[PDB]
Each structure stands twice: as C-alpha cells, then as structure tokens.
C-alpha cells in the first residue's frame, strides 16, 4: 500500500490558525492511523478518522503544536510513516519607540525600540535609524529554545546635538519568514525628534 | 478638565482577543494623552489620538499586555492620571486523552490527560473521570514558568474490569478565571473504553 499527505512535508502557519494536516493511504482496505510527535509528547491537536484519511485538527495553533508531526498508517501488519514539519510565525504588531527624555544639550537620552509578540526571534533583526542612519540593529540567536511570544528590544543610548531637532528616529522590526526572498517582512515605528 | 476612560477600572481579556482602552478629557481645549504601563515597559498596543480621546488598541492581546495601563492626559501645563487593570487568560483548546495501549481485561494501562494554552496554571485543575467518578484531579498552583502557555497533564494508570467496559474515561479541564461565576470554566474530552 502507499502513504502520503497534505501538505506534502511542512505546514508554517500563523500563531493562532486552524491548522489541518491530512494522512492517506491507497492501496489498502482497512487502514488504522496513529500521529505522533518526534518525541511522543501530547499532539496538542484532535485526530479524526474517515475512511482512508486521517487528519491532525490543531486549532488554535500554537507552540505546542511546533514539531515534526509523523503519521505512521498500518495496513495488516505493515506500516508505513510520513512526516510534517509544522512551524509558526507571529508578526501582528508595530514596533514601539520610547525616549528616555526630552532633547538637551549635554544630556544623553536612550531610545528603546521595542516588537511585541513577533515569533520566530532567531528570523527577527530590529533596526534603530536616525534619518537614513543605522545607530543600531540587533539580532536574536542566543536566547535559545524560548518559544514564548516575549518582547524582542534593541536601546541605543546618545547624545543629542544641535543638528538632529526635526530629525526622524525610525524602528524596523524585520522578520525573515520567507528564506526564498532578499526582502523581509518589515513593520516600522518613527518618531520625531523634537526640542524641549 | 476631567479625566475618563473606558472600561472604568479593569479588563479580564482573553488572549487572542482585540482589545481596546479608550482615554479621554472634558473641559479641555487641546488635550495630550499618552500611555505607560506600571513599570514604564513597552506598551504592545496601538495609541490613536484623535481630537479629545486617545485609544490603546491591543490585537491581539497576549502577556505583554498583562498590566495596569495608565492614561495621562494633559491640558494647558497641568496632568491628569487614570489606570485600568488588564488582566488575562487563556483556555483555546479541549483537553487530549491518551492511554498506554491496547485495552484488555485486567491488564494496568495509563490514561494520560493533557490541556494545551492554559493560563494561569495555578487556576487550573484536571480531572480524569470513569463515568461520574473521579479517579485524579490535579492542580498546579506550583508552576516554574508563569507566562509559558506549557501544556499541563495528569496522568494515572489502572486496570479495567468487564464493567468497565461501555464506560466512558471523561477528562475535565476546570479553569476558574471569572470570580463572579460559581462554576470554573469547563472544557472536556472523552474516550470510551471499547473491547472485543
């Protein structure tokens, strides 16, 4: 007998999707499908069996549901496994820019810029730019197996001088969803630089 | 002036869910809002100002915005102060039951019964049932990651009987987020124990 599935080998849904993969078998009468999670942990989904077709309903998705779902389908004693990479992403907000203060001369001010819940973080590089200027870009590859939607920052501390009033602080938040494009995803946040 | 926002004083949100705090003045001319939370951390929301109302737009609500969010509204040089209190929640999916193995008369298998998404864990409970008797409940008001969004098991291991046999295994996953009810919040799954 044969196996296959839909999709064909990986699902990236967004935080939150209903999320369907199926499980098919041809070529055998009466097959029974058992899914299980690389490591046999809880499928955090709910199984449904009709016929030939087995499907793994995880709705809401969510990072639990983040593993290499494999269906193992038994034909009299036979079985057969097919796997599905299921990973999410989450990008629904702006950044957010914050001052430490007001302009003044002699006094440096820290700029926070900040993403909320932006998933994954080893895909994301936030931008702080002073008009076409880059200040500071930040990277996270190092705040390891978190899976939880924290908030990613980058704060840049400087002094202001005369010629930056009236210049525009930009955030860019980047998320590399797509390894198949140059161009990442890109929410932005600006905000004036204005004397007080 | 006067100060007012909508809701008066609190939120209990769902996580996931759009959210909206809306702040504004009377008897003020040409009024300023901002937004903080508590400790001054990133607000994860959308501040819209428009002529005498600001609006904190939070969608979706998730644990950044687990905070008393405070609006300032300000007229002429003078500051006005308002907070709402946004708590949350989380319980998106029925419980997953699970046993061991094959089902056969005598024979000790375990049932394990697993919640996905929960928060807070220390308002949860999970029952594991055989028809209206209880045979574990667990509670987890000791948990090494509040703001995880892990999923919760219990697990219990028995042997079946003849009896048992068209019984239904029933786990019941009880979250008491709302104190104005009397009943926890209920979501369960069930799986009968069928034999040859």
Redesign the interface.
Same mark, same amino acid.
């Given at each position: 007998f044969k196996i296959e599935t839909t999709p064909e080998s990986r699902y990236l849904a967004q935080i939150?999707d209903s999320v369907s993969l199926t499980c098919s078998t041809t070529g055998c009468e009466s097959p029974f499908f058992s899914w299980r999670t690389q490591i046999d *942990?809880? =499928?955090?989904? !709910?199984v449904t069996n009709e016929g030939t077709t087995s499907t793994l309903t995880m709705n #809401?998705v /969510?990072?639990?549901n983040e593993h290499s779902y494999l269906c193992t389908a038994t034909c009299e004693s036979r079985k057969l496994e097919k796997g599905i990479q299921v990973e999410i992403y989450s990008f #629904? !907000? %702006?950044p957010?820019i914050?001052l430490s203060g007001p302009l003044e001369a002699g006094k440096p001010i820290t700029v926070?810029c /900040?993403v909320? %819940?932006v998933y994954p973080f080893d895909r994301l590089e936030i931008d702080l730019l002073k008009g076409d200027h880059l200040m500071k870009s930040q990277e996270f590859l190092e705040d390891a197996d978190r899976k *939880? =939607?924290?908030?990613k /920052?980058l704060e840049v501390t400087f002094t202001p001088v005369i010629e930056d009033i009236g210049k525009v602080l930009v955030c860019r938040a980047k998320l590399h969803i797509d390894e198949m494009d140059s161009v990442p995803t890109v929410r932005q946040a600006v905000k004036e630089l204005q004397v007080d």
């Open positions: 939150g *942990s809880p =499928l955090n989904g !709910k #809401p /969510s990072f639990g #629904p !907000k %702006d957010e914050h926070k /900040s909320a %819940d *939880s =939607l924290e908030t /920052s």
